[PDB]
């Protein structure tokens, strides 16, 4: 299954909150991953015999910044990879690793950003999830705010995680209010708002772009977890989510036979398909991840144990190492699933090679 | 005929069978869904992989203050330069909130298996020979909490249709009208209104097919004996056909005490409040507020409305301007700003003190109305509960409305929520009685210039003991 | 002489916009959907009554009627604006029940019932 092939340590000694492999990387190009912790963004390149090559590192001019999340995209024209980062200050930064500069920045969230996700089909649509109780959909081409997902029937506490589905037709969000909310982005309202954001040119007008204020989700539940929900990922049309109750719950909106795209907003039902058990992960802000093919699932715990599940169960390996005893904050799989990276509370990086 | 111990055993045995069946059945549905879902993962994941194959995205290269990376697995120490991300100015902290133009009131074995079990027990009862009571007594013996042997017979044995529908029944006038009667708020002309908790008192709503019949029973209550008008409205019956069918500071709350005057026992009189247009008392009630006979203004002690700390009522104040020109906000009467929502344009920007602040777009005169301080209407208890959380954040955006309610601008409110506190303000807050509702008006304490920050003394709104 | 921000998005105003932040409209859309949703939550209310109530509330919220003297005009304007929806969604009789309930509440005159019903019937003739 997996061999621990390298361990790295960043000089700041602060928790590393995010890891993301660049899945846009060409077939044959070396496998690159980004790291976020302290007020730093670090880029790495994977090589044979466990070799991790330190490529780039950025530091916010503000010492009080603390990056929590990052996400990779690409510029449609230039064909350059782009990396979005954000944390405690509520500012989104779009870094260009080819040009080695901050190419864009968005201020607008009234609090810390806990998650950043790029639309699986449109590289310009960026979703940010905030401590302010709202989600924001940005158009990174026209620098417009397409929609605000929050309000009367939005999250009542800090939004901790969100995920688009495979084709980018809908978003599933979760948070400290114990809620998991569905926000459809293939609706006529949302498709037009995306279209209109692309037509927007502030030079050809004196009026601001009109952002959609989506106060109502397309489904909402509080009956999956008894505490805060800190990670949510779609598994096809099913949902994978966790709290501090030492389990990842696999579930779906409505009754067993209810189709995801036929679920009415007033739906009071949920169907729990099953759960993935583990231990010592009762601390807040602990994220699970999947490979591109959604066949593998990984989750680290507060004492450095790394759990890997084979999702094709229509199996659990406990990856462990004597020198790894810190809280594993997040994991990342290479596109091809050959490399698995884990980041910790002690500025350490752990490389696990599949063989 | 089988005995009680036997039946209890059968109940157990059958319920255990139905449960282990549902279990293994459902386990399979689960495996079927994961499998059917896996195909969707495959299909969509190939669409994405195909789109990725059509892209040639540029690889990242090495960079060139510095930083190092160390290895606990003895790989060599690495050193590169640390590129500085240029400072970006942040905005003050702000949490999600919903815009409001008016206040918003906020208040402080299953049946599927049970039926299956009964039917399974009936099949054993049937097979025994070579709806039975000896079955209900056994289910109640094994599930006492679910109910008694009688209650389970009742449970096992198991609205008004629209007059426009095919199931339209012939019913009583009150049956037909009930939903409209109990959901309508006379005070704000809406059904299930966001402002008034209590339902309207029964005196407030008083002054041949199923559908034709029900409409007749309704129309006779309004057009007592004008069968010409009853026929006109029914449309499918005549002047004669219809005739032939016949032959076969406390919060205000409307008072309703039939055959009793508004005396010392009247809730309005007790609450030391005037009776309003919504009260069900006599038209000659001596406690009703008469309104004002002003020609214009209504902004001095000369106006009984203004003097009573009330806005002008549009149904009583017929000469000042409060009743006319609904298209306009600048009306002859200067005592109807809250009710009309004649607010001044306000602007959001970081305060010159801390956090966010509110700035007036255009000049305002001393005592001129700026905006209403809108929010959620919550009970004193809800405010005590909410306050526990608020203190953790050092935020306090809730203000006493009267003895019974607090307006809280934290979750819902309007732009004026951004007016900061000051013991040296340029604004003041005035709770007014506005058509039976207590509403907070924010007025200029002195003339104010274009772009000036707004501040009011929070303590005056908090000080109610 | 200061950077202003939109209250709904917290994004800054350009000098082009010249101190205009008016996402402070009389009827916030969310209230329109909150009302629609709430009426639907009732088990004891039928689908006919529900749709008339929803349409009436949406009408009252749009025009912001605040006086009882505006109630006669409100019913007339309800026919003009929502009459097509009433006829098409088959809520002609439920609307009739709403008018008499309004008369019971002392908000509208007896002639308003006739006038509104007469107006809806000739609107149906146009179809
Ligand atoms: C009226 C807004 C206003 C006014 C003025 C004059 N000046 C300003 O700067 C602001 C902005 N502002 C200040 C900071 C802030 C904090 Cl620190 C906590 C808040 O609200 C908690 C958020 C968690 N709460 C919850 O209930 C969650 C945990 O469920 C309780 C209320 C809020 Cl609502 C705010 C906020 O928006
Ligand atoms: Zn009301
Ligand atoms: Zn009385
Ligand atoms: Zn009274
Ligand atoms: Zn009275
Ligand atoms: Zn007057
Ligand atoms: Zn008056
Ligand atoms: Zn007046």
Author numbering:
A (entry chain E): 67 to 380, 386 to 426
B (entry chain A): 9 to 72, 81 to 124, 166 to 180, 193 to 199, 219 to 246, 260 to 308, 432 to 472, 517 to 733
C (entry chain S): 562 to 688
Quote the study that presented this structure, word for word.
Each catalytic cycle of PRC2 transfers a methyl group from the cofactor S-adenosyl-L-methionine (SAM) to the ɛ-amino group of H3K27. The catalytic machinery of PRC2 resides entirely in the C-terminal SET domain of EZH2, although EZH2 itself is neither stable nor active. Here we report the inhibitor-bound crystal structures of the wild-type (WT) and the oncogenic Y641N PRC2 consisting of human EED, human SUZ12-VEFS and engineered American chameleon (Anolis carolinensis) EZH2 (AcEZH2) subunits.
The structure in complex with compound 1 reported here shows that the ligand recognition is nearly orthogonal to the SAM-binding mode. Nonetheless, the rest of the ligand occupies a hitherto unanticipated pocket that is partially formed by the I-SET region from the SET domain as the base, and the activation loop forming the lid of the pocket. Tyr111 from the activation loop and Tyr661 from the I-SET region are in contact with each other making a closed cavity that is accessed by the ‘pendant' piperidine ring of the compound. The C-terminal end of the structure reported here, often referred to as the post-SET, is largely disordered. Thus, analogous to kinase inhibitor terminology, pyridone inhibitors could be classified as type II PRC2 inhibitors that not only compete with the cofactor SAM, but also occupy the extended pocket that is unique to PRC2, accounting for their exquisite selectivity.
